[PDB]
């Protein structure tokens, strides 16, 4: 087990986002004491801060993360990729800090088809928001009230791929899946 600071805290105090310079420090990090931001500057680079663009392969470094005490904000993501592979092993989001003081998990306008958060089993506080992912299926299948642990939590799934359009293609929970829902089309992606 290893605890590491999040974006905006400690050595990342003025870091706007996980980027090519600071992603190395998250190696073997199983718990993040703070927030995680993934923004377009990450993959575009930033001249003023002398930050090179991020290699989408290095996002595998976060696979070891199993806990985040703050919130998770993903407003940018490589399009060649179909899901959030890096957060495969993320198990808990406590949301002691929250985006705008409300949201503990935000996915905004990604090319992903599935969330791919297999291990996520609790969201202690804060509201979930999944917005603008025009290819994202399987979202409404899961019962998010089972993950919530605080009263007042609500999910806001809007402007995403219509549930009917997802059904036509065949991108629905697998046969073996139970009513609990599914994170992806594969059985290993099932709750």
């Amino acid at each position, epitope marked *: 087990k290893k605890v590491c600071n999040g974006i905006g805290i400690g050595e990342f105090k003025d870091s706007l986002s996980i980027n090519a310079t600071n992603i190395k420090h998250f190696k073997n990090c199983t718990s993040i004491s703070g927030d995680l931001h993934i*923004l*377009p500057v990450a993959f575009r680079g930033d001249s003023f801060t002398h930050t090179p663009p991020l290699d989408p392969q290095e996002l595998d470094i976060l696979k070891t993360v199993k806990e985040i005490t703050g919130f998770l*904000l993903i*407003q*940018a993501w490589p399009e060649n990729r179909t899901d959030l592979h890096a957060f495969e092993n993320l198990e808990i989001i406590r949301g002691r800090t929250k*985006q*705008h003081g*409300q*949201f503990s998990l*935000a996915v*905004v*306008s*990604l*090319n992903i088809t599935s969330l791919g958060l297999r291990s996520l089993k609790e969201i202690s506080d804060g509201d979930v*928001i999944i*917005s*603008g992912n*025009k290819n994202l299926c399987y979202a409404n299948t899961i019962n998010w009230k089972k993950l919530f642990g605080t009263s007042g939590q609500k999910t*806001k*799934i*809007i*402007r*995403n*791929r*219509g*549930e*009917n359009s997802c059904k036509a293609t065949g991108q629905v929970c697998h046969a073996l899946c139970s009513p609990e829902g599914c994170w992806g089309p594969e059985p290993r992606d099932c709750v």
Partner: T-cell receptor
Amino acid sequence: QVQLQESGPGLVKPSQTLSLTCTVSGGSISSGDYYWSWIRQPPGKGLEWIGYIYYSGSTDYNPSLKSRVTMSVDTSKNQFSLKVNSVTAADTAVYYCARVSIFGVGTFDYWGQ
Amino acid sequence: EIVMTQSPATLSLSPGERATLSCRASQSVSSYLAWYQQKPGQAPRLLIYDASNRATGIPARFSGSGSGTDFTLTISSLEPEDFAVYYCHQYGSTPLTFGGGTKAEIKR
């Protein structure tokens, strides 16, 4: 304060391309909190959603326009633009630009003239 | 697309009356529905969002209810200013769609 204003030629010939640009004030279009959308209203009819553009370059377009729409941003001048090619009479309309607060109300809150 | 239907397309009403505007959806839009007001020459103005929450600066006489496929905008007492067209709007599924519009005309 937040203010949106449209600008562009009012007369386009059929089969040509329609170009509009929306100048934003009181805020930066480059932000993860806001979508930037175009809506149109043919004279005497309802409202049609065209699409939105996000600061990350992501876009969404209405299938009803059959891929004839593109949108771009110019963070330098704090503008975002709309291009619609192969226009006919059915594209005659009042074109509006509107903002959305992804983490606020969640729908068009500020409109242009 | 999710088609939004507003019936009737015209309401003849007198000042002080209670107006009731309806909006149906071909598919469930959960609670992700807004109401807009449009006066001739101006752009739509947001009244309600999440089907029931009034926006800032909207008199209390405006109110919304409903969920899923059937929604209602209620005006407790029409004022002279409230004679305009009202659109329902769904933001829950893309592509985004608007209702046909319901005009409120002065009865005489």
